[PDB]
Design a protein around this ligand. Structure first.
Ligand SMILES: [Co+3]
Length: 256
């Protein structure tokens, strides 16, 4: 699978039938339709003991991986029961500033979207978690182009070393708190992974407040490669799936 013309999102269903599932992601968030929910508890994002250890170009995107063998960086509260461990984060972005995000808001597309993936500790490991309906909690944060995001630069400045499919590089001591906006107001709905195998194991938590990154910052993302070394060059751009049928779901809001 890929994002190209012969192996893009509208092809995934052939190898992966759950693509036309009942709780697929991403979706469009219609703000006048999301109901404020007061029984939602405030989000709790406990990242001060986070341990980052590697970044990898996997042929689709780049993942920054964390030590999840302990309860270091964890998400709880909001619509969540129990405790969720951070395992990695990545981005989806476009070939132009006017597209790139996966979620949209009142049909508006942002230049990119950050995904912080967590797995429920009651299932012991990520492999087992993805087989469960509340197996994962993903934090989704929109990127708009404006002034730079200081917290992002150290990520940007390693991409050269991981330019092609399969390359990796040590990434320790990175603090994911520097990628968070001021507000934790959010929307939440039940959904899925947005790449194959598209498993319907995710509680989505999408922040209302975007972060701002610079045009230079986004253009370094656009220099990465989908291909392998010594392979024909194809830029890593437009690695986003478009919005899927909301179907029988309700999006809830934390804020009035
Ligand atoms: Co993602």
């Amino acid at each position: 699978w890929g994002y190209g013309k012969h192996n893009g999102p509208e092809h995934w269903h052939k190898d992966f039938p759950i693509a036309k599932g009942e709780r697929q992601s991403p979706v469009d968030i219609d703000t006048h339709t999301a109901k404020y929910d007061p029984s939602l508890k405030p989000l709790s994002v406990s990242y001060d003991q986070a341990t980052s250890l590697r970044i990898l170009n996997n042929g689709h995107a780049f993942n920054v991986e964390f030590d999840d063998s302990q309860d270091k960086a964890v998400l709880k509260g909001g619509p969540l029961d129990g405790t969720y461990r951070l395992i990695q984060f990545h981005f989806h972005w476009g070939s132009l500033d006017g597209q790139g995000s996966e979620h949209t808001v009142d049909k508006k597309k942002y230049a990119a979207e950050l995904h912080l993936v967590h797995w429920n500790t009651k299932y012991g490991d990520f492999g087992k978690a993805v087989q469960q309906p509340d197996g994962l909690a993903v934090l989704g944060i929109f990127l708009k182009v404006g002034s730079a995001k200081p917290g992002l630069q150290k990520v940007v400045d390693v991409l050269d070393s991981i330019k092609t499919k399969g390359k990796s590089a040590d990434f320790t001591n990175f603090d994911p708190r520097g990628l968070l906006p001021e507000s934790l107001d959010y929307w939440t709905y039940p959904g899925s992974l947005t790449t194959p195998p598209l498993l319907e194991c995710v509680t989505w938590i999408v922040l209302k407040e975007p972060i701002s990154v610079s045009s230079e910052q986004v253009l370094k993302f656009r220099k990465l490669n989908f291909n392998g070394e010594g392979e024909p060059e194809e830029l890593m751009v437009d690695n986003w799936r478009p919005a899927q049928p909301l179907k029988n779901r309700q999006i809830k809001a934390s804020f009035k």
